[PDB]
Amino acid sequence: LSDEDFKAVFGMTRSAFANLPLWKQXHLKKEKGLF
Amino acid sequence: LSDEDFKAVFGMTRSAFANLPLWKQXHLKKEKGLF
Amino acid sequence: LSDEDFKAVFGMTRSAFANLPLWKQXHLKKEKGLF
Amino acid sequence: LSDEDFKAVFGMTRSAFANLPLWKQXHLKKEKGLF
């Protein structure tokens, strides 16, 4: 994803996302239809 | 937890829980604050 | 349900709902026909 | 890691992990700081 699209999809910075638990980073990608 | 307490806490049998993705079985355990 | 529609149906966010005891989260879903 | 801790963290069983290439099993450990 572009920076703009990552923001649009997840609503947080890449750094914040990378700090979430691994289960949640699973959940969010599934919730947003990315894999 | 005993099987009966597991049902009371998670709202499903262990066999059903086992058929959830491992990231979801992460989510639910964390939502209940348990193991 | 979307977070938007969840709040419209249950009168609270998923975060708040997740804090209710399971028997009550039973009650509410059964009362709305969404079990 | 115990098998239980492994599958909770990696989101897959040790058996599932073993299916992946050796360089990928490198990536998946190092991504979590677990090598």
Swiss-Prot record, chains A, B, C, D:
Consists of a large core fragment in the N-terminal portion and a small headpiece (HP) in the C-terminal portion. The core fragment is necessary for both actin-nucleating and -severing activities, whereas the HP binds F-actin strongly in both the presence and absence of calcium and is necessary in actin-bundling activity. The Gelsolin-like 1 repeat is necessary for the actin-capping activity. The entire core fragment is necessary for the actin-severing activity. This is Villin-1. Signal peptide: none annotated. Specifically expressed in epithelial cells. Component of brush border microvilli. Phosphorylated on tyrosine residues. The unphosphorylated form increases the initial rate of actin-nucleating activity, whereas the tyrosine-phosphorylated form inhibits actin-nucleating activity, enhances actin-bundling activity and enhances actin-severing activity by reducing high Ca(2+) requirements. The tyrosine-phosphorylated form does not regulate actin-capping activity. It comes from Gallus gallus (Chicken). Belongs to the villin/gelsolin family. Residues 29-32 are annotated as: Absolutely required for activity. Epithelial cell-specific Ca(2+)-regulated actin-modifying protein that modulates the reorganization of microvillar actin filaments. Plays a role in the actin nucleation, actin filament bundle assembly, actin filament capping and severing. Binds phosphatidylinositol 4,5-bisphosphate (PIP2) and lysophosphatidic acid (LPA); binds LPA with higher affinity than PIP2. Binding to LPA increases its phosphorylation by SRC and inhibits all actin-modifying activities. Binding to PIP2 inhibits actin-capping and -severing activities but enhances actin-bundling activity. The gene is VIL1. It is found in: Cytoplasm, Cytoskeleton; Cell projection, Microvillus; Cell projection, Lamellipodium; Cell projection, Ruffle. It comes from the Eukaryota. Monomer. Homodimer. Associates with F-actin; the association with F-actin is inhibited by tropomyosin.
